[PDB]
Amino acid sequence: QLKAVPDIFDEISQRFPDRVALIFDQRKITYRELAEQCSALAAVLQNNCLIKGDIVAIKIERSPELYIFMLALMKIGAVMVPVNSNSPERYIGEVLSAAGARYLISDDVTSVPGGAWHVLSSRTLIQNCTQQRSGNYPVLSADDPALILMTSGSTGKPKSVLIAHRGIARLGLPVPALGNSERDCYLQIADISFAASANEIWMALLTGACLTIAPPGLPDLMALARQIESDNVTMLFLSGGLFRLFVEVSVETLHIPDCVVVSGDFVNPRLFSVAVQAGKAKIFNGLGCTENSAISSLYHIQSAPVPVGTPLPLVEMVVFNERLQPCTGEYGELFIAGAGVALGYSDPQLTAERFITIPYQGTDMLFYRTDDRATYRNIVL
């Protein structure tokens, strides 16, 4: 039942109109209010001459408006390019050109680089939203492009990864290991230009759960700790750096949530031991990668080479040997298939370098080649 993100959010906001969707400081926004404002904003963007397929980058500090724009842009069929607000304008130009961005919606127009793109003031556009919500919006498919994320090329330059609607609409499907539902609360702290931010934004908003939004800027751990407690975050995603620092300075905060998921490259396993011993929360190691759109697998730390764990719904992960059969103790290479798989890189030749069709379980599947050595059941990188 995999629909485009606007369609899944419509079903969710119609099923949970009186649940809280967004929290920011003192502002709280219900799902019904979020749908209303997204509809009025989508009508405003179509008056500013935005149409389906337009590559539109977003540079807006963490705020409710940030996510309203994300929803309104995808409803009118556009492809978002989220841009990190804590990055110098030397590198924003580079990102827009690598993405092909034609527009840039920004909260601080004064600080934008120079290129073949029109810059739109998020502040004025929000002010233009006046009571009008009805427009004609495209039929969108799960495979239509939804957003463009950057990974690093082999010389360190931004390299475009094109994400389909399904890559993030899959996050609407509850994750058995986590037991998540519309009753949970998530924290938006990962930068929007990382794939990891999709774990927070879309597991919340496509399930009926609440997203509490961290203040803009670099992390301030006393403020974050107060916010996790006061808003009662129950599903906490942390990068490896933020996880390790919390274990080092305030490990008790990690046991306010029901579940903590650590993403990004392998954390020292010793850090997981200290954490699970300090309390009740379920602590998971997560595998995610930009080319599979978001979090792809979870491994639950029971107690004390952290494994990859169980893949998420609609994701397939296999360790393939030289016969292109699953490895028996046999060392091999990790490949990822399923709903998450990126539409690809900027052109077919680049794509063919890491995305390959392999027969598996009687079905020709498109796999992303991680280039990461691995073996097994369970999978360890």
By the criterion CB under 5 A, which residues form the site for Br ion?
267-268
Interface with Cl ion includes 288 (CB under 5 A)? Answer: yes
Residue 85 binding partner per list Br ion, Cl ion, none, with a CB distance cut-off of 5 to 8 Å that depends on partner kind: Cl ion
In sequence order, the 6+-apart residues with CB closer than 8 A to the CB of 136 are none
- From Br ion, Cl ion, none, which one binds at residue 313 (CB under 5 to 8 Å depending on kind)? none
Q: Which does 263 bind (CB under 5 to 8 A by kind): Br ion, Cl ion, none?
A: Cl ion
Tell me which of 61, 258, 330, 333 binds Cl ion, using CB under 5 A.
61
Task: Provide the minimum distance between the beta carbon of 41 and Cl ion in the complex, in angstroms, as a whole number.
Answer: 19
Can residue 62 be called a binding residue for Cl ion (CB under 5 A)?
A: yes
Q: What angle do CA 340, 59, 261 make, to 5 degrees?
A: 40
Indicate which of Cl ion, Br ion, none lies near residue 268 (CB less than 5 to 8 Å, by partner kind): Br ion
Q: Which is nearer to Cl ion, 144 or 200 (CB)?
A: 200
Residue 125 is a binding residue for Cl ion (CB under 5 A): no
Q: How far apart are CA 14 and CA 172, in angstroms?
A: 14
- Which residue's Cβ has the minimum distance to Cl ion? 288
Write down the least CB distance from residue 288 to Br ion, Å: 16
Q: Which is nearer to Br ion, 288 or 340 (CB)?
A: 288
- Please name the amino acid found at residue 86: N
Cβ-based nearer residue to Br ion, 56 or 260:
260
Is the separation of the CB atoms in 199 and 190 below 8 Å?
yes
Question: DSSP assignment of 98-117, as one string?
Answer: HHT-SEEEES-TTS---SSS
Q: What phi, psi does 72 have (nearest 5°)? A: -65, -40
Tokens standing for 356? 């390959």
295: partner contacted, choices Cl ion, Br ion, none (Cβ within 5-8 A by kind): Cl ion
**One-letter identity of residue 70:** M
Is residue 207 near Cl ion by the rule CB under 5 A? no
Region of residue 130 (phi > 0: left; psi between -120 and 50: alpha; otherwise: beta):
beta
CB of 32 to Br ion, least distance (A): 42
Binding partner of residue 196 among Cl ion, Br ion, none, CB cut-off 5 to 8 Å per kind:
Cl ion
Cα(22)–Cα(35) distance, rounded to whole angstroms?
Answer: 12
Restricting to residues 71-100, name those near Cl ion by CB under 5 A. Answer: 85
Nearer of residues 39 and 293 to Cl ion, judged by Cβ: 293
How far, in Å, CA of 62 to CA of 50, rounded?
A: 23
**263 near Cl ion (CB under 5 A):** yes
- Beta strand pairing call for 158-164 and 185-188: unpaired
The answer for residues whose C-beta is within 8 angstroms of residue 176's C-beta and 6 or more apart is: 310
Residue 216 or 269: which CB sits closer to Cl ion? Answer: 216
253 binds, among Br ion, Cl ion, none (CB under 5 to 8 A by kind): none
| Pairing state between β 145-152 and 158-164 | antiparallel
Residue from 99, 190, 295, 336 binding Cl ion (CB under 5 A): 295
Euclidean distance between CA atoms 100 and 13, whole angstroms: 32
Contact footprint for Cl ion (CB under 5 A): 61-62, 85, 196, 216, 263, 288, 295
